[PDB]
Design a protein around this ligand. Structure first.
Ligand SMILES: OC[C@H]1O[C@H](O[C@H]2[C@H](O)[C@@H](O)[C@@H](O)O[C@@H]2CO)[C@H](O)[C@@H](O)[C@@H]1O
Ligand SMILES: OC[C@H]1O[C@H](O[C@H]2[C@H](O)[C@@H](O)[C@@H](O)O[C@@H]2CO)[C@H](O)[C@@H](O)[C@@H]1O
Lengths: 649, 649
């Protein structure tokens, strides 16, 4: 048996790990399946994609086209339906009708062998007719057969009868395929919409308390949920909600020794009060948590819990499972690190003495929170635990509960970032915050929206508790407006960490990405009511951005994206499409000066002729414009960060 | 089981067809095996390549290194030995000694936990000692253990004792490897030297006849062999040696109708006298052929026969196996084509009615010639027969006779060109003749010497009977000199078609790549003696080039090649290396004007410091120079085409 078939079909894409892991989609998501298809000699080939659902049922006729001339690379778009494990095959075949047509159109006017040529076409068309299930369509092709064979009629006339629009339509739908050859099937994991699309808000429940009880509880924190839902968010990400250690507890601003009232860092998990399956007593009980989750659900909010596989020195695991830690020769356990950052308040887990025990406990813990309605886990620093460990855990959890979504917070090198997605993380954090110039943004999003989208789904948090970028520090409110627009329009998942709306941008010191008086080490009450009435919050822009996303399919996908040229380096333009919805975005990346530029639209890439002039609406302002090939913009920081335009139907 | 192992080892290269076909080498050839290797957390990894022979025996310890910083891409060079099917694996592992060393060098001067750090080092070194088979080497490491643990000595001293040259040497040879993880094995087909390296000469035996009998025989053609071997060639490629049809025979200069004496085209195979297993009666008998092959062998010449799976209309297959042809409805068989080229004198084969019959006959035919000492076949236009057909044939023939070498004459699109090599053709014809500028040459050879070298071995014929390039047409003798130097220095296999030496460069017409009065359609006697005495042959240059190749290992490999910059667009410079042999070539691509240029050598890419000045010899002239970072050259067409320099030892 040979490796190559009768009609070569090679290097089908997408492929992940040579086919040992699945390519990814979500319900309703479209992507391109490609392959290299050609044959011996000079006749035409054709190709089609066969998509098969979890029950093995084939999808519709999906013909491919050569993507670039001379390349022999063919592609077609397909769309994922219900969730589960699917497969895809490319079929390649000889296309003797296109071949015959080509020769006939030349030979018949040339008067070469006209009778023989016409009879050859007749016999092809007859075979094409025997396959066609439609009776009307069959009649249409037999009619052409008769005409081709009518030796009383002129050659050019007989031939034209085989090339009519309605003959073409039948053959496009039901082609004569010679020597059909199939690739081996490749796997596709189709997951729920939220895996790709959703808007995330991160906050610390303990900061939302009262005058009498400063340390907020799940019952007091629940009062923030309505305002979070009204901003158009879908997911609430909570830092660790468990008891927090007392030994080597950190004080305010990442100081080494906590004083009497200091609350410490949520990520220092565990004390005699409980571990990863417990609630910090100052937040309340598990019933209070249920109330929180229930209230969230009624508002259309899902909860994402933080999962940080690490311990404070007071965690019960320290004495109950000492072999889950590496002990130095004097018995001590080295505190965790991410240099030059030190985490003196925690111990990292060791995985090589009891991997099975660690895996079993981990899935028990996740299943506990799952039983309480948490169907999304934000995995803290996954890259400091074994890659195969995450592979096994996710596979175990999705085996019984395929809706559960894991987000990898791995700010690390590309190989690890990619591998973590490929072994099963539904979402990844990304380099977004360190991509601030037009060249950085264009390059990174080209990468994210290209081949990487077969395995990685990005979550663009414009900030986190650990990341306050210099761009926001030096930019002020107009920088916050820009980044919000970008994150929200460039990824179908984006997020902010509470305080972003208020444009909090004071660093620990010059050249740091830490916030001053960071919420990680202290309660951080905020006067939300005053910021609203005084207008010192960008919460209305944020709300508008999420509304636009909810109203425009184009912004709920990743892969269709294109950058249009502009004559200003500060000014970036791009477009996204889904069916007939097309969103056009122009952003001024300069937060200090007004920028004017000419934006030159790739009109065909919008599906328009070059000379066309289509109307748009800037959904940020409601204002209408008529745009075409070349368009003047003028964007004033503080007044307008961008144009976020929909092309009017 | 998980897809990733304990220490990630991903995307091992080379790989061909996702591992479904073997990567290629020949005996004594070196190539790079790479992989993506990393681990969780911040500790050090290491990696090594395990190469296994046909009996499964592992080769030597072959440690890998990260190929560039931050990339996590690791590589090592391996070398193929005896012929057969081999495999290769990459092992990745934790490197705790490098890790410890890093921390120890910082902590010990810092005075941080010196006793604990030093005891930890001692326990690592002890475990490394337990594995070391050498008794002296073991003593060396135990001695360091003792010093590390000597608490009466200063910290920095104890530590220095673990970091000596002789401790380093033992650990480089026998490292402590944690958590060893292996890739799945990938296949490597190792073939004989000729598959990669050899010089080829093509000529028509029928042209070497006498005044009395113009149509030469194998016995008269054998007289050209000494001259061919004296020019330094290893392989003689003969056009088809079989009877030639009379129906639609072509006349001189590709005219449609032959006149009474016209000999026709050798590729129009077959007549009542015999087919592909027969000898044209005017060349003599099978015994005369044996004499020719024996005489060749004594001169160090192997024969490559042309194999053209096609028939004249008078071939016995036409009536004996009509289902090996496609018949139109009137019974006729359309003549073969490669548009706009027409081959009215032959029929192409049809493969879909009797594929088993065609395969059986093909291998019988090849085996017949194999039994008569032909171990190399030049396959005519393989891309007009099914890819899987060639896969099956080659696999059948190499199954019993692995030394047999097939050369694919596929001047076609890249996908087919690549696929043909990947399914088993040992050699391929290339785009060489259509690469004439420095940018063309540099780009194409970069491609050929990179990843494509894991499946394709190029044969650079500077000309063929079908290809006389405009460059030679317009260039004259100095162009022939340039292209000879390029072909011979850029590929370890090159070739010429007889008449190239004489600088025959008259085309059929302006803008054609056909020769006028082409040897395909007529006997073409040449006054070899006169050319020699009158010095109008570049035969001596050709000889010198093959001598230099025979004397310099660097030129008998493909993959090590590097282009050095020059300030002239007409002037190209490159280098090739194998062990301590380094060849440096500078060519003036302008056949009409002298060019002077400064050539700026990548000194490190030669393995020298920038300021070094190493002597060279121009092997074309014998002249010595001293070259370094920047060197003036002056190359005068007709006097010097190029400098072909060896770096002196
Ligand atoms: O309590 C441990 C540690 O928590 C914080 O660092 C986190 C960070 O916020 C997470 O998102 C992620 O990067 O991992 C780290 C630990 O899980 C504090 O910033 C740090 O000072 C504290 O030691
Ligand atoms: O006699 C058949 C046909 O042969 C030649 O074409 C060859 C050519 O020499 C080969 O190098 C390769 O291109 O395949 C062709 C077919 O075997 C003649 O040049 C052509 O005129 C002739 O009809």
């Amino acid at each position: 048996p040979t490796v190559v078939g009768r009609i070569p079909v090679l290097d089908v894409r997408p492929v992940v790990q040579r086919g040992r892991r699945p390519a990814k989609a979500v319900t309703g998501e479209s992507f391109e399946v490609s392959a290299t298809v050609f044959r011996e000699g000079h006749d035409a080939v054709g190709a089609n994609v066969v998509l098969r659902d979890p029950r093995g049922r084939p999808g519709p006729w999906t013909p491919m086209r050569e993507l670039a001339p001379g390349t022999d690379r063919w592609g077609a778009t397909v769309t994922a339906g219900e969730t589960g494990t699917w497969s895809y095959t490319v079929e390649a075949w000889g296309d003797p009708v296109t071949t015959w047509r080509h020769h006939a159109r030349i030979k018949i006017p040339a008067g070469l062998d006209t009778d023989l040529v016409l009879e050859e076409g007749a016999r092809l068309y007859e075979r094409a007719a025997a396959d066609v299930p439609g009776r009307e369509d069959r009649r249409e092709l037999l009619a052409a057969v008769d005409a081709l064979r009518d030796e009383s009629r002129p050659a050019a006339s007989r031939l034209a009868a085989a090339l009519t629009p309605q003959v073409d339509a039948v053959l496009a739908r039901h082609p004569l395929r010679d020597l059909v050859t199939s690739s081996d099937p490749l796997p596709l994991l189709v997951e729920r919409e939220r895996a790709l699309y959703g808007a995330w808000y991160e906050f610390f429940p303990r900061s939302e308390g009262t005058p009498h009880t400063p340390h907020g509880t799940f019952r007091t924190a629940a009062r923030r949920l309505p305002a979070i839902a009204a901003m158009g968010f879908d997911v609430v990400y909570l830092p660790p909600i468990h008891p927090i250690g007392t030994t080597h507890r950190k004080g305010r601003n990442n100081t080494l020794s906590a004083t009497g009232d200091d609350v410490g860092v949520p990520w220092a998990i565990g004390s005699p009060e409980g571990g990863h399956d417990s609630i910090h007593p100052a937040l309340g009980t598990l019933d209070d948590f249920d109330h929180f989750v229930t209230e969230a659900g009624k508002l259309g909010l899902e909860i994402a819990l933080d999962f940080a596989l690490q311990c404070s020195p007071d965690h019960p695991w320290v004495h109950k499972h000492p072999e889950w830690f590496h002990h130095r020769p004097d018995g001590t356990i080295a505190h965790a690190e991410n240099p030059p950052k030190k985490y003196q308040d925690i111990y990292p887990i060791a995985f090589d003495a009891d991997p099975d025990g660690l895996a079993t406990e981990t899935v028990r813990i996740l299943r506990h929170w799952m039983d309480h309605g948490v169907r999304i886990f934000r995995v803290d620093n996954p890259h400091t635990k074994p890659v195969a460990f995450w592979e096994r855990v996710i596979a175990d959890i999705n085996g019984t509960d395929p809706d559960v979504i894991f987000l990898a917070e791995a700010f690390t090198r590309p190989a690890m970032m990619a591998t973590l997605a490929q072994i099963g993380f539904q979402q990844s954090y990304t380099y977004f915050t360190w991509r601030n110039t037009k060249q950085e943004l264009t390059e990174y999003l080209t990468e994210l929206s290209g081949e990487a989208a077969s395995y990685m789904r990005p979550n663009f948090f414009a900030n986190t508790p650990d990341i306050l970028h210099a761009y926001l520090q030096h930019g002020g409110r107009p920088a916050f407006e820009v980044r919000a627009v970008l994150a929200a329009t460039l990824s179908p998942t984006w997020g902010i960490y509470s305080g972003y709306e208020l444009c909090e941008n004071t660093p620990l010191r010059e050249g740091s990405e830490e916030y001053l008086d960071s919420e990680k080490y202290q309660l951080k009450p905020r006067d939300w009511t005053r910021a609203a009435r005084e207008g010192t919050t960008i919460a209305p822009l944020v709300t508008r951005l999420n509304t636009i996303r909810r109203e425009n399919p184009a912004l709920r996908q990743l892969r269709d994206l294109h950058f249009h040229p502009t004559d200003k380096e500060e000014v970036i333009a791009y477009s996204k499409r889904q069916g007939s919805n097309t969103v056009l975005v122009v952003v001024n990346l300069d937060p200090r000066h007004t920028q004017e530029a000419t934006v030159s639209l790739d009109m065909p890439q919008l599906g328009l002729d070059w000379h066309e002039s289509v109307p748009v609406r800037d959904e940020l302002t409601g204002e209408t414009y008529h745009w075409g090939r070349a368009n003047y913009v003028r964007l004033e920081p503080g007044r307008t960060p961008a144009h976020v335009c929909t092309v009017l139907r």
